[PDB]
Amino acid sequence: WKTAFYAVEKRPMFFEQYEGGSSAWCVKYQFGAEDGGFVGCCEHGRILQI
Amino acid sequence: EANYDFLSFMIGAAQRSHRINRNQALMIGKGVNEPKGWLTENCFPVFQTLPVDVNGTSTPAFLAQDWRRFVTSFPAEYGEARSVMHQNVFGYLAAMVDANGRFLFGDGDLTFTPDLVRERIRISNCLPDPTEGNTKGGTGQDAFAAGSFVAAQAAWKTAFYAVEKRPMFFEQYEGGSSAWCVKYQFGAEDGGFVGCCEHGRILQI
Amino acid sequence: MNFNVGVDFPSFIAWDGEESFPVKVDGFNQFGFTFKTIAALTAATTFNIFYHEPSDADPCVPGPAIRVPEVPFCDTVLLSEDGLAAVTLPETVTPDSFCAGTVPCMNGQWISIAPATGSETNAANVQITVTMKGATR
Amino acid sequence: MNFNVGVDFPSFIAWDGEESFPVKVDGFNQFGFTFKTIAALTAATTFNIFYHEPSDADPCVPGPAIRVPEVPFCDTVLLSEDGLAAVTLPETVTPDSFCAGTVPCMNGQWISIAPATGSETNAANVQITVTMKGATR
Amino acid sequence: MYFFSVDPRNGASSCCCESISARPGEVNGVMVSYAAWSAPLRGHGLTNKTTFEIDGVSVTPPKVSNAFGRTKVGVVFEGTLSDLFPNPEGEQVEYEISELNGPSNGVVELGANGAFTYTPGALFTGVDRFWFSINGNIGEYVISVDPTTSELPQPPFTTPVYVPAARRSVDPRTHVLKFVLGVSPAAIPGDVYRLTVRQVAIDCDGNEFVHISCYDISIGSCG
Amino acid sequence: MYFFSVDPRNGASSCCCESISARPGEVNGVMVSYAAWSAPLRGHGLTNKTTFEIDGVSVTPPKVSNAFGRTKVGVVFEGTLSDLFPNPEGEQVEYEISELNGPSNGVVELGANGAFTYTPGALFTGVDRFWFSINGNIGEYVISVDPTTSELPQPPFTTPVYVPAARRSVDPRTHVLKFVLGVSPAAIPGDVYRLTVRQVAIDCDGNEFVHISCYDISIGSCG
Amino acid sequence: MVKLNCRPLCQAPTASRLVSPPCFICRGVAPSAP
Amino acid sequence: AAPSRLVQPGCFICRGVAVS
Amino acid sequence: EASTIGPAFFTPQVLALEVDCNIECASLLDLYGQIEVSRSTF
């Protein structure tokens, strides 16, 4: 697995109050993170099926 | 240009191509223009297992009792000998089973992984394997290809000799190379032959 | 010294003036169109954009034709009526001049262009084509 | 987040299966083809490569079609018996796989592809497009 | 390659002209060594102002006529091959397209009866020839593919024996003249032509020394 | 391996064409050395624009006719051999399949009375021929094995004497043209064919020098 | 002198079986009957 | 050398009770 | 603006891995008897 599939880390989550749209009666938060991954080289792996 | 260094790639992909061709030759190389390999010269004494009657059909087979009788038969007067075989064969031995269902090796471990250098097996998975890669051999019926190769054994330090004259070399081929294009030339010179071929043995089906 | 740039930015046909062709955009991760005119147009020409899915039976043939939605980016005031992506080749665009647009958000695995209705008369003089960017195999 | 990859490597149709097209390559400095078939071929097909020159009547329209000479590098041993460059799509190219290639030396302002004689009824099942590189002006 | 050393006109040393054999279809090369005549005339050597002329002393006029056609690029061209051979007697006609003299940028599907279709090569504009043969009589058929705009000129129906437009050269350092002499595939064996060569020298100051010679081309089959 | 040094076209040193003896079945090689003709024409040597033509001056038309079949992969094919020997006089038909000229990727067994069965080798598609011999007279039976999908085209019924498609070559360093000359197993001894060769050299600037020769191929048994 | 370069757009999977030795039989048992 | 067989002992158990 | 301007203003982070996925095989050249030699035909 250390060379069959890769995981890509860029940035953890964040949280901040969305100012525009949050009145003095309501309030609206906003969050998100950014990451991804891919499959390195599928000749280093097997699967056992029926 | 071409940030990826191409020359060092070819110098790497030539010693590699040479390495496996030499290893391939000394085994099955045929006479002219390549050393006579010990698989094809076929003057090692060869033993072949006898079949078994699965409900009266006599399919070819190879079971652990055959392996023990093949390796202990080597006359210890020749010296200590190592066995070579394809890794699927060793997988084949490790997955056998007695009539009640137990494993013949490692009576319950999910895995049989013994010290190979204490058993003189030297797995090299380029040799011919009788499992046809995999997905053949070890059947009730419709597999295992009578007449195949399984494994070998010999005092290799004296049953087969390897001859080296001039190792791999690279050189710019001055001539045929101009002020804008280079022509490289590489080469090596080596060979092999069998020693005394009463020191080896082969197992078949 | 020119480079064999067909690998690493290949290009395929998408509308030869008579038929649309789904182009597989899965293996790559960026793509765009490069319009081109073959003879003077008569009025504005509008094209619809379609994206496909892997077919239910076979996983390497495109499924049906689904119309890709459209997204704005902090300045869209046209805001096409039914919120469906479309491109309008403007009138008075000469030959020997190419326009190049691209849908922002990708979806599906096959994309296609088709001449929107009411504009398939002088749409036989355009020839759209696609070019991808960077294999991800 | 895909880019408008159209500009900065545009692409045009060079052989739609029924008629060829000259594509201008003056504005750019490097270019290549991307072959792609639509149906299984019956035998090896061969295309000729042609380069044009600016017509004397108008410098924005291609003149007659000259054929581009052939340049061997070092490894070339076939030399195609004619000294006139040509491509040959080999048999057994399933119609979900593209093939790229380009000439080592451009000349003139335009470039064109057409099926060589003998393989004119299989070329109706192939598509050839040209994608350029950075623009000089 | 032929070679003729010319007489130096010193009042010193069967027929008059030298002999040149030729074969229908060949295109050969000729060298002439004007050294013996121009070397005494010490000047600026030879000048590329040589003129040729071909005359027929035995012709046997051609049986089958030649013809000409036209077509646009990419468009197939079809025509007849029977109204070109007026036959005096009544007999059959075995049309044939000599493979060694087929077209150069297309193919011709010669039908059974003086009919044929000419498919020009893809993306090709120019002139193209092929030499038919009716009952052994050879004549050329010229087709000019136009680049779809207007037209190309009408080429001049190459003669039985010709010297090409410009493939000549004069080496002023060794006083040697070279040129090409090509023979049509429509030449008739046994016929004799005559090529007269007018070569001009030059003095140190810029005057002329003319010199005229002749040659007798004999169209023989099998060389 | 024959070797002909062609005439130098210099006006200097029975029949016209040189001779070539060929035996039915062989496939030989031929060399031609244009050195004496193209070396003085200082250019870029020869070019691979040579053309060959084969005409018969004596045929003795064949007695038996050929036949063409069709079949898919793996499926056995059956056929007869009695409708191929048009006998003007009455005689017995000693059918025989020559072991030398049998099929290439299959196997046939000869019946007792004009019968045979071609069971193709498993996993094989293409075209396979085999040469039968009806009463000393020889023909061919050509069958195509189709990959069961649609159909295959028609092969061209190989001629008595042929020059293979693309096996010609030329070395511009020594002015030598090499080509292969193959004879069908059905060529009748005593016949004579004629082979013609149009080889084109080239000057420094891309023009052409043509040269034509001929060769008389006489199909004689026993070398 | 064009030198082509081809890739497939969709690779295919590849299945295979995993035959393993059967529970053995032994050739000839001593106490038996004809 | 010709291929020699490798006959090994079978399932040998008994010496005193024949099977019915 | 962005996402509609060529693809040259954005320079990707060239990471430093190089996937290989190529088994040589297994070596079998140390068992044999080794003998250095000289001019051929010993």
Residue numbers in the entry:
A (entry chain g7): 415 to 464
B (entry chain h7): 260 to 464
C (entry chain l5), D (entry chain m5): 1 to 137
E (entry chain V3), F (entry chain U3): 1 to 13, 21 to 230
G (entry chain g): 1 to 34
H (entry chain f7): 10 to 29
I (entry chain h7): 166 to 207
From the study:
The 5-fold symmetrized map was used to build the model of the neck-capsid junction — the neck 1 and collar interacting with the 5-fold capsid vertex. Since this pentadecamer has both the C5 symmetry of the capsid and a C3 symmetry (present in the C6 symmetry of the tail), it is resolved in both the C3 and C5 symmetric reconstructions of the neck. The peripheral ring of neck 1 breaks the C12 symmetry of the core and connects the neck to the capsid. Our work characterizes how the β-sandwich domains of Milano neck 1 protomers (gp14) adopt different conformations to compensate for the head-to-neck symmetry mismatch and bridge them covalently. Five out of 12 gp14 β-sandwich domains (n, n + 2, n + 5, n + 7, n + 10, CCW direction looking from the capsid side) display pseudo-5-fold symmetry. These domains are covalently linked to the MCP (gp9) by two disulfide bonds, gp14Cys117– gp9Cys252 and gp14Cys120– gp9Cys440, which emanate from a head joining loop of the β-sandwich domains. The head joining loops of the remaining seven gp14 protomers are not resolved in our maps and thus likely to be disordered. Every third (n, n + 3, n + 6, n + 9, n + 12) collar subunit is attached to the neck 1 subunits (n, n + 2, n + 5, n + 7, n + 10, CCW direction looking from the capsid side) through the disulfide bond gp14Cys136—gp13Cys19, linking the collar to neck 1 by five disulfide bonds.
